[PDB]
């Protein structure tokens, strides 16, 4: 059964990933992804993009990771999944920092911030302020950095 194989690949991919077998995680998640597309299973397709992006981070392939996180972001928006939209924006902000593309990093970190505030995810808001302060400082934008450094301090005391 092709559907059972899709489940099995998704499970194998996750286990390889957690064992540090990132190459073999990619091989398995790609087959999960293909089978998800065959069956029109958008939930599984989205999940596979996110797990692929994560594996490529640990393979050091940051541009490839960004391509998979952009795919996850698109699908999360289509599915109206705000928490997953936020997660993929945070992963993109970090990925663009690894690529030393601070303008794109700031874009996606601001997107994550907005959703974390809407969702009352205060811990996530603190992460966003940490990340944004760091990025603005890397660029010399110290008035923006001040705003987010103050907010990181305030949140750091709460959660």
């Amino acid at each position: 059964s092709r559907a059972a194989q899709g489940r099995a690949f998704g499970n194998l991919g996750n286990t390889h990933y957690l064992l540090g077998n990132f190459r073999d995680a990619v091989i398995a998640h790609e087959q999960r992804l293909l089978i998800a597309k065959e069956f029109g299973d958008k939930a599984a397709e989205r999940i596979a993009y996110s797990n692929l992006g994560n594996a490529y981070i640990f393979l050091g392939e940051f541009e490839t990771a960004s391509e998979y996180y952009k795919k996850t972001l698109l699908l999360a928006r289509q599915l109206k999944d705000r928490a997953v939209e936020a997660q993929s924006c945070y992963s993109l902000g970090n990925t663009y920092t690894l690529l030393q593309d601070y303008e794109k990093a700031i874009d996606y970190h601001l997107k994550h911030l907005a959703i974390a505030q809407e969702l009352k995810d205060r811990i996530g808001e603190g992460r966003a302020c940490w990340s944004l302060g760091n990025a603005y400082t890397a660029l010399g934008n110290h008035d923006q950095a001040m705003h987010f450094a103050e907010k990181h301090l305030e949140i750091s005391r709460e959660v």
Partner: peptide
Amino acid sequence: QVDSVQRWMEDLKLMTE
């Protein structure tokens, strides 16, 4: 390394869906 990125990666190593 950027400390916030390091932390994100430490969490990411444990993350699956």
